[PDB]
Design an enzyme around this catalytic site. Structure first.
Site, short mmCIF file in Angstrom:
data_model
loop_
_atom_site.label_atom_id
_atom_site.label_comp_id
_atom_site.label_asym_id
_atom_site.label_seq_id
_atom_site.Cartn_x
_atom_site.Cartn_y
_atom_site.Cartn_z
N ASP A 7 0.65 -1.38 -0.23
CA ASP A 7 -0.34 0.24 0.04
C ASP A 7 0.50 1.69 -0.01
O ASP A 7 1.54 1.33 0.63
CB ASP A 7 -0.66 -0.06 1.50
CG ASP A 7 -1.98 1.01 1.29
OD1 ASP A 7 -0.99 2.08 2.04
OD2 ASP A 7 -3.10 1.10 1.07
N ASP A 105 -2.67 2.57 -6.76
CA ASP A 105 -1.68 2.51 -4.94
C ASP A 105 -1.63 0.33 -4.15
O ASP A 105 -1.68 1.33 -2.94
CB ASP A 105 -1.20 3.44 -4.16
CG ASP A 105 -3.17 3.68 -2.98
OD1 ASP A 105 -3.73 2.59 -3.15
OD2 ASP A 105 -2.95 4.61 -2.51
N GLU A 106 -1.87 -0.70 -4.81
CA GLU A 106 -2.59 -1.67 -4.26
C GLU A 106 -2.15 -2.36 -4.99
O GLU A 106 -2.65 -2.18 -6.04
CB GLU A 106 -4.07 -1.59 -3.26
CG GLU A 106 -3.85 -0.23 -2.53
CD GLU A 106 -5.61 -0.55 -1.52
OE1 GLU A 106 -6.50 -0.56 -2.06
OE2 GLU A 106 -5.30 -0.37 -0.45
CA CA Z 1 -1.69 5.02 0.18
CA CA Z 2 -5.57 2.81 0.69
#
Ligand code: CA
Ligand code: CA
Ligand code: 0OH
Ligand code: CA
Ligand code: CA
EC number: 2.7.7.7
Length: 341
Positions: A7, A105-106
């Site tokens: 993350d 973003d993961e």
């Molecule tokens: Ca993040």
């Molecule tokens: Ca997040």
DNA sequence: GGGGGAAGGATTCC
DNA sequence: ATGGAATCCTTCCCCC
């Protein structure tokens, strides 16, 4: 099975810093303006400097400014953040071939046939926090446990720049002692419903008749929570596939005038069709946000693909069904293509 | 009694 | 108070 979840810390704001390292140490808010008035709009994300004073994602820019007038307010540059994410995703694929890119973003890595024990796991965790910090100069947080859900909870506990392993025996103390609103998939609406059912911790779902639970939160959430609580959740990491593209714009002012709206509607289509690449959708939805922030949308599926010219025509029609059928003023208007061949 | 779709809305997450 | 996307839920629909 073992899941390693990554993350990217305070992502957009962190990108703006990387691109202008002078920003570090200063409150940074990445804004999405709307050009109605001067500071109309909302906040996309902000660093931990700003966030520690209640400046988070979703508040109006206006609120944020009262709180931190002298913060650095930057306009959203999504294209940029998308290219940077990509590079990290390429880098990530160089640790597991089993990879689920879940968002900008993961991502989730299946690392079962690539490590034994949570000690090794933890180490490979460090190798990646590192390689990214060196290559793209970005801090991330890493969660490790047996399924995606507890991998992701682990990350949530260590944010930012953290790393955290949930072992199998801790997964158990969690189910007993974890607040249900803290489970992914449980927004404010679902949390409250469960409160009324007297369901506060993950374990409480076992004490209730499935049918009453199903009646309150739908069958899917129902079985989701139940299996999670039985230590039986084990959904597989797989290549997510993009199933719809679309644009939405905010009008200078709310209106019900077809000719006033159309120029926003077509601009949405232009952007949309650009974003399509070479993809041919069979379906199109026209999406309106009424003045009261409610949402309403009419759509249509073709047996063939939808040309730009054709999409123009239909969207105008579908816009009209809205104005005809709904009776509100419209604040935002956009489109969404889906059902690609 | 049920399989598909298709449409409209709901809710969530980043 | 933005903007993008997923998933699931109900109803309706046609038909077997
Ligand atoms: Ca993040
Ligand atoms: Ca997040
Ligand atoms: N409510 C929101 N509106 C627009 N963009 C959002 C959003 N919530 C999250 N995002 C984006 C930007 C942000 O940097 C982000 C994650 O937020 P985070 O860094 O976890 O804090 C990738 C999503
Ligand atoms: Ca939550
Ligand atoms: Ca409604």
């Amino acid at each position: 099975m073992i899941v390693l979840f990554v993350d990217f810390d305070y992502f957009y704001a962190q990108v703006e810093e990387v691109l202008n390292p002078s920003l570090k140490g200063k409150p940074v808010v990445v804004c999405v303006f709307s050009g109605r008035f001067e500071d109309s709009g909302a906040v996309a994300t902000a660093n931990y400097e700003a966030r520690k004073f209640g400046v988070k994602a979703g508040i109006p820019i206006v609120e944020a400014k009262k709180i931190l007038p002298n913060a650095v307010y930057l306009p959203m540059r999504k294209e940029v953040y998308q290219q940077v994410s990509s590079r990290i995703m390429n880098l990530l694929r160089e640790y597991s071939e089993k990879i689920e890119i879940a968002s900008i973003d993961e991502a989730y890595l299946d690392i079962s046939d690539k490590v034994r024990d949570y000690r090794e796991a933890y180490n490979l965790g460090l190798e990646i926090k590192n390689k990214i910090l060196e290559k793209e100069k970005i801090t991330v947080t890493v969660g490790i446990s047996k399924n995606k859900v507890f991998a992701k909870i682990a990350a949530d506990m260590a944010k930012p720049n953290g790393i955290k392993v949930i072992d199998d025996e801790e997964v158990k103390r969690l189910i007993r002692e974890l607040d249900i609103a803290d489970v992914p998939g449980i927004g404010n609406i679902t949390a409250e419903k469960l409160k009324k059912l007297g369901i506060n911790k993950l374990v409480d779902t076992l004490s209730i008749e499935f049918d009453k639970l199903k009646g309150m939160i739908g069958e899917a959430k129902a079985k989701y929570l139940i299996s999670l609580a039985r230590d039986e959740y084990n959904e597989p990491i797989r290549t997510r596939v993009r199933k719809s593209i679309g644009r939405i714009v905010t009008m200078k002012r709310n209106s019900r005038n077809l000719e006033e709206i159309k120029p926003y509607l077509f601009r949405a289509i232009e952007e949309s069709y650009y974003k399509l690449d070479k993809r041919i959708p069979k379906a199109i939805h026209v999406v309106a946000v009424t003045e009261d922030l409610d949402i309403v949308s009419r759509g249509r599926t073709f047996p063939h693909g939808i040309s730009k010219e054709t999409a123009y025509s239909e969207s105008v029609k579908l816009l009209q069904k809205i104005l005809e059928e709904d009776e509100r003023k419209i604040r935002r208007i956009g489109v969404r293509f889906s059902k690609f061949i």
